[PDB]
Design a binder for this molecule. Structure first.
Ligand code: K
Ligand code: MG
Ligand code: MG
Ligand code: MG
Ligand code: ZN
Lengths: 132, 337, 62
RNA sequence: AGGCUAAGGCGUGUCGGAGUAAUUCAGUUAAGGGAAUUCGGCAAAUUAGCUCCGUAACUUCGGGAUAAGGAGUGCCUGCU
RNA sequence: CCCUAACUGGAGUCCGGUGAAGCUUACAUUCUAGUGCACAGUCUAGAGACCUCUAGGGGGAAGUGAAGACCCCGUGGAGC
RNA sequence: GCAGCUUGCUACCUCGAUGUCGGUUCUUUCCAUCCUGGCCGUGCAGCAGCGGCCAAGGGUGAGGUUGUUCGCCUAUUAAAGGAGAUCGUGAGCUGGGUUUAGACCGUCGUGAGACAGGUCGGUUACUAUCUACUAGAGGUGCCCGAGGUCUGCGGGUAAGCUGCUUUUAGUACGAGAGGAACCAAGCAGCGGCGCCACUGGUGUACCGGUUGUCUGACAAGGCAUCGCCGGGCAGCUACGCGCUCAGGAAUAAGAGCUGAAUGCAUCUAAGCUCGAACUCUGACCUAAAAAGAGACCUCUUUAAGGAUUCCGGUAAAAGACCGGUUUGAUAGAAACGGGAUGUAAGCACCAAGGCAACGAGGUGUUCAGUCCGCGUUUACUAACCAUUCGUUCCUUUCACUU
């Protein structure tokens, strides 16, 4: 994918149950794997902001639940540094359901998204109310 | 058996991992001349790290044009003295030292390292080297230099460090003429390196003493129930049944750090003369304050503070003319905060 | 170079250092150090803490 | 009970020095994730006293039951 | 666990004192291959190897501990 | 036919024991190659396949069931190859399975008991002599004596490997649908090396709050895991940060040139040009113990210089290493700078109330008090006083001296 200007620690590993913060009907999704991630022996798949993950809808509507979907993490509590040396951290982890291309399935995103995902996925940027 | 694969633990490219035989890094290769004559190496002393805010001038970079915070290593670079000219003869068995002329006047603290060469043969020694060059017995010339750490205060030593440096020139006669120009003089780091260029740094790394395989080679710990069965920071196996031996490639405890290492393509971000420009409030921790002229190297450099860092022009650099960096802010805040 | 003020102690963030903390409601808080971030996370208010500029302002109200 | 102290008994659950590696026995803490570890949550962590509210399926009607799930709690002043 | 880090006390490490035991026909600085009762540090042909000491985890010595408790055999037993 | 990685056959070794299966950890090898590199064919338009050749440098992962091996399944992935190493690896681990004694179910047996079914439970010994390896020292050999700087016989390396996106380009190709490649850029995964400005952790220095109790109270302290809780400098560390190219040579498969045998033709028989993530070189680490045991220079032969003692730390398990030593900032004190914590005690005023005595607490004095395993200034104390080697020792086997 296109590079971001910031360095993002891959804070979430497989099995992490992340709040889904769009209006698709998925409340909590669990990371199964991370797209474009080859690991090493014994290392769990790791995802930070801007990464696309295959997820399983753990909570939400019955239609959404138990479905394997794609989601993009837009918030993470683990601190990451912007190019000018400032470290940024959110209060919680958040993701939004998307397709392969990065287009959100929902229409509004409650909460702030990281600017890095807003640039790597412009549609997530336009869909979000505020970009921090 | 169906096997899970893992890259080998650590690198065998730095074996045996023993203590460096000197406190000075020795350069095994010298790059090719690409201009006017000059020394190919310089030696300073590592002070510490700070960071600068500079405009990203790196071509094709995503953050180009905007302000970025760049960690830098400050290295004090007092003028070195060109102590001697050494001529080499190449044969089938490699280079051999054939001639040496020492400068007539040398620093008194040089006696702490060696008995001082007298002010004897310099004209006749130089004419001997000239004759050897004319008769084809000389393949190249090197300059013997030493540092003068007495002007520094964070480095406690007064005894100089002596090393050979290459001279970059298009021809051997040009090298000899330039070396005779610089013999016995004090060369500044601006006479070797220019701001914004890449250099290679060599130093003896931080010594950690005897370390186990977990820290020395990065082997895995014992996991789960195995973590508390009595071998937690130990290698799982020393070998197979056959061959009946422990391979040298099996990770084992031993000396860690205090090795010679060369880093490549470390950019000089500023050549300074006023040490107040970079010294933080309260001084550098355990060092003090920079007094003479210094150099800012982007990123990290091998070695702790007060180690001699040898700088040579890059041997495997890729990028072309980088430019002069636009340092907007040098952080002088307390490193002790 | 963006000039940023620590939300807790009121000190100006030195460039190339410090943290930005973002809450779920989009509220952003600059922290100069880990100490200010810790005191913010403890629930302490700056006006009740004497060593901060807001604590000094509240005390100087008298 | 546990903790802190008397009296009484001791510094003899009879080697000392030194303070510098790996490793190891036993502990403290640990970002983000939270069983992905493992045969298996083994080990560790969580909860925890008391008061009040409230307490399911099922039941041999005895119970389940401290089920679950919630709230309070210190000090000072004056009292019933 | 990802993936380990720092720290605490006891060992270890180094010093003084005290002071055992267990493997041992001999020699012995090995490595490769072959050979050989077909699983060799000692044989054969090569390859290496200056000696002594310290620390270290256990590759090998088919390491040490125990006249295999599995199998068979014995015109051997015992109990049932 | 090959292999010996399945299962048999056999009984040569081992019954005065060579510790079982599977996993885990770590190292290595094979190639019959899963990916990555190079090729050839195609019933190869492109995309993508199918088949084959070279190639073992790197990679080949994460999960659910099951003790499993094997296999099934899931989602990633360039791909998630297979096999050998006493079915590598228990003086490394584990103990799920099998393989003791207990017990249950089914079956068998009159029975004791049995089962190549199933089930629940079931002790994992040892202080390392030799050898091997990983690191660290002391010697002797080489050698004017010493020191310094080099060289490089050699040893080692994966020091990088591999994806995504942008561009080429919606272009070549194709009726359309679809859809490449050279060059170029950035980013990422894994690996490697280093570093601590930043951020995170720790931080039993330190600062504060507070519980129980003891020292009569206040103040100051002890103990309870550092009592607990909050914060945290230095240091260490990763979850943080920096760097991590080629180019050239010679080749494999293969593609060609010239070219005869064989008038022609022929990549081949000589000869020649190209041609891979292989090999070599180049980087990088190490390397005079390279027995051909090195080169050069300087200093000095009762010296040069080394060690010990001394004050230390860029070093450190012991050794070693690197420094300073009055012609001195090496360590410490003092003060100051720079930091940590959070505003000390006493005093005054207020304090819900109480007739009063008292009164948790608030405010001011007061960014105070306390503290700093950082720096600076500063010889104030301590780096003083020595000793020892550089001579075989006694001797007049003397180059000397009572
Ligand atoms: K293998
Ligand atoms: Mg002791
Ligand atoms: Mg018979
Ligand atoms: Mg073994
Ligand atoms: Zn602040």
């Amino acid at each position: 994918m296109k590079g971001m200007r910031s360095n993002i620690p891959r804070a979430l590993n497989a099995g992490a149950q992340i709040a889904c913060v769009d209006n698709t009907g998925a409340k909590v999704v669990e990371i199964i794997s991370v797209k474009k991630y080859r690991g090493v022996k014994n290392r769990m798949p790791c995802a930070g902001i801007g990464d696309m993950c295959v997820v399983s809808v753990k909570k939400g509507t019955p239609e959404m639940r138990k479905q394997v979907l794609l989601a993009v993490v837009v918030r993470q509590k683990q601190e990451f540094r912007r190019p000018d040396g400032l470290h940024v951290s959110f209060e919680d982890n958040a993701m939004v359901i998307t397709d392969e291309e990065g287009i959100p399935k929902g229409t509004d995103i409650k909460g702030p998204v990281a600017r890095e995902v807003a640039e790597r996925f412009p549609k997530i940027g336009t869909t979000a109310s505020i970009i921090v | 058996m169906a096997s899970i694969h893992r890259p080998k633990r650590g690198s065998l490219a730095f074996s045996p991992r023993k203590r460096a035989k000197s406190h000075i890094p020795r350069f095994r290769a010298w790059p090719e001349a690409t201009g006017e004559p000059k020394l190919q190496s310089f030696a300073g002393y590592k002070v510490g790290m700070t960071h600068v805010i500079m405009v990203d001038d790196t071509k094709n970079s995503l953050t180009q044009g905007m302000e970025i915070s760049v960690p830098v290593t400050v290295i004090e670079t007092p003028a070195i003295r060109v102590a001697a000219i050494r001529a080499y003869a190449e044969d089938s068995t490699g280079e051999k030292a054939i001639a040496e002329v020492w400068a007539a006047d040398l620093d008194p603290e040089l006696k702490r390292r060696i008995p001082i060469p007298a002010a004897g043969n310099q004209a006749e020694a130089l004419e001997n080297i000239g004759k050897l060059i004319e008769e084809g017995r000389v393949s190249d010339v090197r300059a013997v230099i030493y540092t003068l750490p007495k002007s520094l205060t964070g480095v406690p030593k007064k005894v100089p460090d002596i090393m050979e440096s290459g001279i970059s020139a298009r021809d051997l006669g040009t090298k000899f003429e330039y070396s005779k120009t610089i013999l016995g003089t004090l060369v500044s780091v601006t006479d070797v390196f220019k701001n914004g260029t890449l250099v290679d740094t060599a130093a003896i790394t931080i010594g950690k003493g005897t370390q186990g395989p977990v820290k020395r080679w990065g082997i895995q710990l014992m996991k789960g129930k195995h973590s508390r069965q009595g071998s937690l920071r130990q290698v799982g196996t020393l070998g197979a049944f056959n061959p009946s031996r422990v391979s040298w490639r099996v990770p084992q405890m031993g000396q860690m750090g205090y090795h010679q290492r060369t880093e490549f393509n470390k950019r000089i971000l500023k050549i300074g003369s006023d040490g107040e420009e970079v010294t933080p409030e309260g001084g550098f921790i355990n060092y003090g304050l920079v007094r003479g002229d210094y150099i800012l190297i982007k990123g990290s450099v091998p070695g702790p503070s007060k180690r001699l860092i040898r700088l040579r022009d890059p041997i495997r650099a890729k990028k072309a003319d980088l430019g002069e960096p636009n340092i907007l802010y040098i952080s002088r805040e307390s490193k002790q905060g | 170079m963006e000039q940023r003020k620590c939300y807790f102690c009121g000190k100006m963030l030195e460039p190339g250092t410090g943290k930005l903390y973002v809450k779920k409601d989009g509220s952003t808080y600059f922290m100069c150090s880990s100490k200010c971030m810790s005191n913010f996370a403890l629930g302490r208010l700056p006006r009740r803490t004497e060593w901060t500029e807001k604590g000094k302002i509240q005390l100087k109200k008298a």
